[PDB]
Amino acid sequence: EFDAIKIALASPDMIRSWSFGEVKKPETINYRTFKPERDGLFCARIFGPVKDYECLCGKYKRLKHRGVICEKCGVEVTQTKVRRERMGHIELASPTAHIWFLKSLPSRIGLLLDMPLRDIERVLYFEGAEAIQALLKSMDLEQECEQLREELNETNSETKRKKLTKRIKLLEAFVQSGNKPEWMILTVLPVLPPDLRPLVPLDGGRFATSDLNDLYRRVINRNNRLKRLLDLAAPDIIVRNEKRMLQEAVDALLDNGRRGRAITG
Amino acid sequence: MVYSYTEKKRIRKDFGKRPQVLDVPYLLSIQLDSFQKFIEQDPEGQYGLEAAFRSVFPIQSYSGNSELQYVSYRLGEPVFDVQECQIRGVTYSAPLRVKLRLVIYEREAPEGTVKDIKEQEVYMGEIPLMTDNGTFVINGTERVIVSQLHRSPGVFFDS
Amino acid sequence: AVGRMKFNRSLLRDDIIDVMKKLIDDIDHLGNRRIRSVGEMAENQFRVGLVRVERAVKERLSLGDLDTLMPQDMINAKPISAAVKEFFGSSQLSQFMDQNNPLSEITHKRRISALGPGGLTRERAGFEVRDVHPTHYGRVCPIETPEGPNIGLINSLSVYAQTNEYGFLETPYRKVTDGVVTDEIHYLSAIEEGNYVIAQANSNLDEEGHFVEDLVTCRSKGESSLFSRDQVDYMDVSTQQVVSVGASLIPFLEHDDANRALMGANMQRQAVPTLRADKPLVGTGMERAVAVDSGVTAVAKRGGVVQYVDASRIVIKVNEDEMYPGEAGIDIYNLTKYTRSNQNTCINQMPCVSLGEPVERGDVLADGPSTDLGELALGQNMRVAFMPWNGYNFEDSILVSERVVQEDRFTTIHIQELACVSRDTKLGPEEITADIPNVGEAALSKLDESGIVYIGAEVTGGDILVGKVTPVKDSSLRVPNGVSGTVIDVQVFTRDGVEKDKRALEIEEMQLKQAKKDLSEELQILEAGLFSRIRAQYDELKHEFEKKLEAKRRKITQGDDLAPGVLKIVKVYLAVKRRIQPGDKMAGRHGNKGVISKINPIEDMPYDENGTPVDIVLNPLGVPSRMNIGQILETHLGMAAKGIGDKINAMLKQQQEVAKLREFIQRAYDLGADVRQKVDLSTFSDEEVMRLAENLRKGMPIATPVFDGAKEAEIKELLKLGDLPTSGQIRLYDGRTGEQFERPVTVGYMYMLKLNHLVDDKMHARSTGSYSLVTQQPLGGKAQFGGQRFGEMEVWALEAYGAAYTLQEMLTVKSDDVNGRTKMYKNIVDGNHQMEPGMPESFNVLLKEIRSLGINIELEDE
Amino acid sequence: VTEVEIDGVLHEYSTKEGVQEDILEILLNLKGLAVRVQGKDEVILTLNKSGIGPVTAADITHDGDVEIVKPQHVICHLTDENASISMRIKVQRGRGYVPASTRPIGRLLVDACYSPVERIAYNVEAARVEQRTDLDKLVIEMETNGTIDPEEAIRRAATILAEQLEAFVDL
DNA sequence: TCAGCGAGA
RNA sequence: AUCGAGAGG
DNA sequence: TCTCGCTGACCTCTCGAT
């Protein structure tokens, strides 16, 4: 049926569209219970029921009960094959920078601007990341593209002409592709469906823990700490250090080891 | 040319030409020597559990004048021998019995003598024992810990 | 301390300054690397546990207390126990032992690894570390290394190699003073031997010890050059000083290339012990040392006269000089009987002594696996004919006579352990009783009243060994599939506090009563001598005996430390015999290997003029393509040895006076250009000579030390003494036609080994089964019953063929198309097969993973 | 020998007290047993012995039909006087190698090497009949276990050959 | 490890 | 499932 | 023009510990 594979940047509205539930605050399914924790990384409300065509309360038990939500259960009747499909998101307290665009071989985060990789890294490391988002939003593609085109037309050197035409090509790509700038800064972070990260049971009580689950849990821990320190006024230094920790956490989640030491459990 | 009763039953015809001046040593002598150095009593703190104890035995508070010491250590008889350790699926280990000592000095009076000395014997974990064949029995499975070839400590100059 | 010594020696001796001064002004060399054994690593782990305990003690005692601080509450044994348990069981160097044969255990225990914690990495390592170094001579075997990524990094200790106090490998050398070799031995490390010039072992010497040649080949400073007698400082102690234990077992090693010697040394370790251990006709003389030092053979601790002999146990009456004053004078050697191995093989000890036979210290009393009268016996001597036979030994293949299968020369016992574990569950859904729901009457009767199968019963696939039902679906332990065998042993484990069912009590008490009877008999055997001596403190002896019996009973009845959550564990041991079939890997000691392709009838095999057929037919084209001439030389020498044995057997068949046998055996032992061995039969008694001739009737064993083996002339002389052609080739006749083969064919006895690569363990075939969760793909193992990976290169092959539909069905219909798989199975079963491929689930997984990265990827309809 | 039943033995992979040889070795030694039966194919032999000393093929109870050609070779050994051995041996008649794997508790199946012929060698030499020198003589050399008569072996082989050839003789 | 690669200085 | 240690091709 | 990160380097089986 499909004829092409279209790839583009995802808007925060696009990420919220994918997600079925806006909750990721807890960490693990349970310490001793097979039932998924409510609003956790694994949850029946968000990602779907572990049980196949069943309700725990049992008010409606029939084939017609499919698609009907029990008041006590509050969970869909669908299978786990949709639990592989359902997605969630984490509402970040503060915007954060995507590690791919900031730390690529060409820094397209720095390529739209004029600052080098070191300057952007220093700005986003102090935290910070909202400053880069504001700089990207304040930039105008049309006016900057016209100025760069004029400068390339009145060019005296080959290297300067190459840099100007690279910048103009990037601006034209942003204009034509339909992806706005400042989307390199992520404010809504989607979470993978639960079945794609096994957390496989063992014969004993202990389960082998997938690395993605641990990384997500640590990122959510940092996000909750930032939410608390924003709800209650805190000194600027502590909040900045905590925001740096959150940025490092999301960077290790998206691509571990790109900048600094990788997270070791 | 056969003196042992086992070899006298059937003597192998030897075509070797070079006289043998040094007999082949014990094939597992390395494991036996290593674990014997590790286990056996060392009068000096050079090798083994003795040298291990002289490292972090003096654990105490900072300038508290009350330090924790010991006099010696002893390894007990294993509860089970190798065969029934393999049968039961349990580690073949010997309990470690260590006699520790504690000294109490006068508060803010370093010149004064030690107030009291308290010595007592304490059980400290299970140390697995190696059989006569140079192997270990861990959780009912017979195991071998091989030697490691690592760079000698010191200074070297390489490009 | 070794580090401080090395730091002082390197700088010829503020410490940081001296390094910079010499820097302004080869790591693989042995002097730069030292050996760390199990003792030092265990000490380091103890140090880690002890510093953790010290930190805990400091934290606890920072509060401070007057008379309330004691050694007990400060320390805790949990961290030390955890650290030592992790080291013994989870460390990289703590490895599951290779228990295929005594040689495998010896090699594993003498193994040296450059990897491990605080060491190199196989992928990061380069060619410099993996290559042989002039310091490897005598310390590390250059021949025996793994063939995979671990080449050069995993190494085996040499025969004569030691370690000094500082941990550096050293080798023995014969001190040379004033041009004459002196028997005194000095162990030299690499840096120490580099200064000196060392003569070679292959240096002729006179009676007084002087070098025969005016100029003697030597080495110095890592290079070998000719030297005069005066400059020589040291000499090699033996010709086996360089090779390891495994490599020294190869006869005629100097006639093979190092590649095939490596292959033979490795393949000697996968050899599976057979029903009867058969000594190697051609050997080196290291078999006895390997067998004794492996520990698989019972060795008399004290010399005495054998008092009791049995399959299960041996009793030695210690001599008067060897008894302790308090010792009764009885040594009991219980023998291992049909126990499982790490590699699922069998461990068996069979007595090699008779009642009343005198025994001295160090004598072998029982023969372990792959051992024959104290000699390592990894395989069977086989009569080999090097000739093509209708392409059944076409490409390195092997053709085997049916007489080999009939005589069970290569039949092996393999023991499989199966465990049934009952776990604690609320409401009691799981059952362990004999009565199970929906169980056949025959299957129920197969198990005992306790729910466990009887010892000695024959079990085939799909038969329950232990009865269990859980909710209640039958959770009974059963053999998985295909595997068949007999129940040789059953073990039931219960905790001290775990509730014991009466039927389970019956089984466990039967086992405990058998163990207690064995222990009581063993104790009474030793107590009988003391009681008889008392007849010539009876109450005290009786009290001591009763106390020992009570202690043994308590130890037997002591509950096992079961893991939490499980009540009882029942272990069932199954033993089956594997007979050779087409598909089984066979190999020798010279790097040659092959797979049996056909079991040929006895009459069809080529036969000699006397009518004796050959057992093995090997392609001669595999000999000159490779560089393993040692196999041909061993074949000729084995033919000569079997000829000598045949002459001895012929003189035994018709009654011959002992004088003739003594004369012939003395002539056979005296043969050789110049041999150090001097076997004198005049010393032996008539019964000793008769026993020796009985042992030699199947072939006289031959010892050929590596780099010192038998010359070709000696092999020809041995062939002459046995009335055999000196060329080693005889006229063979085709079994199917009776027509003589147009050319002479070399025929002899080569020591063949059966490797742990049986075809039944490797044959696998899957139709459909379990699929993975993250990707709906078939599993990836034979144990998991998974399909075969269709890698990218195979997709390239199908693309090159242009097989679009085959590739499409393998990508979708055979995997990742759940609806496609479900419809395809029905289509195939119904007989009208049509597929509708869809989107693989792995592509959807990829899309979800990419979307979770913040990138929007979608499926554009048009 | 096809089946062996020992009173105190449950399976092959075990040992019996007072016997130096394992049960598997005893089964191999019983496989290496040569007997002749004239009455019927199936016959049961019982072996009983007590006290120290090797157990040979003479120790099987005497049967008129069954003739043990070699009563000298040992089956097992008894080490102490108190021990005793009691086994029932089953002997059948057949041809070729029939493995035990191919088609109760305590009976031990044994691989049957039925064929009594160990080695065959034949040589052709010149023979002088009348004044003709073109004729030759065939000298067949046999090695057996003693179970079969060489002349009877020749007669049986020739009869088998003729029975096979009669198919080619007919159309 | 050990290369090779372009892009900042 | 993952990791470590091996082994075969 | 030259450092300076970033990139790259077939299939199968067995074992145990998490």
Ligand SMILES: [N]C1=NC(=O)[N-]2=C([N]1)N([C]1O[C]([C]OP([O])(=O)OP([O])(=O)OP([O])([O])=O)[C]([O])[C]1[O])[C]=[C]2
């Ligand atoms: N990708 C890949 N990486 C590897 O490391 N190895 C592979 N394949 N093989 C495969 O196996 C054939 C040689 O094995 P071998 O033992 O039969 O050696 P050989 O010379 O051909 O014959 P022989 O052993 O008798 O001397 C070779 O082509 C290949 O397909 C072996 C190692």
Ligand SMILES: [Zn+2]
């Ligand atoms: Zn309901």
